[PDB]
Amino acid sequence: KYQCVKLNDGHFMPVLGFGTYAPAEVPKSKALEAVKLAIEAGFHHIDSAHVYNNEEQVGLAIRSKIADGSVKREDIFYTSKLWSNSHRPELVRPALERSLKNLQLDYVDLYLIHFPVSVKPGEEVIPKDENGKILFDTVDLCATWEAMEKCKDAGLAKSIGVSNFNHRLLEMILNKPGLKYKPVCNQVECHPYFNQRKLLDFCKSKDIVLVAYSALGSHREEPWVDPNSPVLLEDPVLCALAKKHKRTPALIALRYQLQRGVVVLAKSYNEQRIRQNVQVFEFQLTSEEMKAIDGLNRNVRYLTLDIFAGPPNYPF
């Protein structure tokens, strides 16, 4: 057994997820070993995406661990994401099918709209013109959503959700005429320096689960993240809590999320830290400790994705 939350479509999501993105300088082979170790350590939720360029490796990890008898498919919750070159409704299913072919899996447990800004279709994930300008595309995301709903009725995605949506774009989906399925989740940046309380409360009021990425302060990959941004895990309050509980600042930051009702992702490709992160289930924070962590909030967003700023759907 393992800790899961009931989604608004009746499916269950493990509350601790394994993040799989690594910057491009890291070989892909590392994804294979890391996901196997994650499963060994007791992660039951694995977070990837087409744009991570690792689904062949992550899929092989999964398959290997099923095939050697370590785990059943039903006890892996696998998430992929629809990249913005495939927002057009007729391209949604083909993108999911392509992911599933790279994975050699029959379905994903969760498929998300990765980012609300659309780009031109084709193989290139960030298509640019000859002058380096991103080739943006105009797509009705409520039509993209209808295409997601059909993927769910086809059984290719057990649940569907979104990522990097703001209040306005969520309302846009939720208020859609003929809506069949609400998003189960909104996967967004969330940590003690950006605790998303307002958006969390909104999602709760709608029974949408907030899934926290960059919960340990992000991969800090340039130029996506500003190197002058504070280092979350160096925070003196988180470090003092860690010392008090004989844990680590990472574990404090992960436990914080669980207790506030957030499903939390954690990426590590280091054997020791993968095993450490599952220790989030071994301790609890008092109300006073949780308040101290609420106090660290500083409106620091690490991932702006501001190369996609300009179009109206840019969410930040």
Ligand X SMILES: NC(=O)c1ccc[n+]([C@@H]2O[C@H](COP(=O)([O-])OP(=O)(O)OC[C@H]3O[C@@H](n4cnc5c(N)ncnc54)[C@H](OP(=O)(O)O)[C@@H]3O)[C@@H](O)[C@H]2O)c1
Ligand Y SMILES: C[C@H](C(=O)O)c1ccc(-c2ccccc2)c(F)c1
Binding residue positions for NADP(+): 17-21, 47, 163-164, 187, 213-219, 267-277
State the binding site for substrate: 21, 114, 219, 224
Using the rule CB under 6 A, which residue among 15, 16, 19, 105 binds ligand X?
19
Residues 19-37: b if buried by 16+ CB within 10 A, e if exposed = bbbbeeeeeeeebbebbbb
| The entry of ligand X, ligand Y, none that residue 126 binds, CB within 5 to 8 Å by partner kind | ligand Y
Does 268 bind ligand X (CB under 6 A)? Our answer is yes
Token couple for 296:
């660290």
Residue with tokens 């070159």: 85
| The entry of ligand Y, ligand X, none that residue 20 binds, CB within 5 to 8 Å by partner kind | ligand X
User: Are the C-beta atoms of residues 241 and 179 closer than 8 Å to each other?
Assistant: no
**Dist. CA 70–CA 312, nearest whole Å:** 46
**Dist. CA 34–CA 267, nearest whole Å:** 9
| The entry of ligand Y, ligand X, none that residue 85 binds, CB within 5 to 8 Å by partner kind | none
DSSP 288: H
Q: Which is nearer to ligand Y, 125 or 154 (CB)?
A: 125
Catalytic (active site) residue 2: no
Binding mask 231-260 for ligand Y (x = CB under 6 A): ------------------------------
Which residues fall within 8 angstroms of residue 290, CB to CB, at 6 or more apart?
256, 259, 260
Binding mask 225-254 for ligand X (x = CB under 6 A): --------x--------------x-x----
Binding part of the chain for ligand X, among 53-61, 178-186, 216-224, 289-297 by CB under 6 A, reads 216-224
| The entry of ligand X, ligand Y, none that residue 125 binds, CB within 5 to 8 Å by partner kind | ligand Y
**Dist. CA 186–CA 114, nearest whole Å:** 10
Binding mask 33-52 for ligand Y (x = CB under 6 A): ----------------x-x-
Interface with ligand X: number of residues (CB under 6 A) = 27
- Tell me how far CA of residue 307 lies from CA of 126, 135, 162, 186, 311, in angstroms: 10, 11, 20, 21, 11
- Which regions of 84-149 does DSSP assign to beta strands (E)? 108-113
Please list the helix, strand and coil fractions of the chain in percent, rounded to the nearest 5, in that order: 40, 15, 45
List binders of ligand Y among 123-142 (CB under 6 A): 125-126
Cβ 25 to ligand Y, closest distance in Å? 11
Cβ 213 to ligand Y, closest distance in Å? 7
Cβ 242 to ligand Y, closest distance in Å? 26
Which residue type is seen at 89? P
State the binding site: 17-21, 47, 114, 163-164, 187, 213-219, 224, 267-277
Binding mask 284-313 for ligand Y (x = CB under 6 A): -------------------x-x--------
Binding part of the chain for ligand X, among 63-71, 141-149, 174-182, 270-278 by CB under 6 A, reads 270-278
In angstroms, what is the C-alpha Rg of the chain?
19
Cβ 34 to ligand X, closest distance in Å? 8
- Which regions of the chain does DSSP assign to beta strands (E)? 4-6, 12-14, 16-19, 45-47, 77-82, 108-113, 157-163, 185-189, 209-213, 263-267
DSSP 94: H
Polymer length of the chain: 316
What are the residue numbers of the active site?
Answer: 52
Name the residues that contact ligand X, by CB under 6 A: 19-21, 47, 163-164, 187, 213-219, 233, 248, 250, 265-270, 273, 276-277, 303
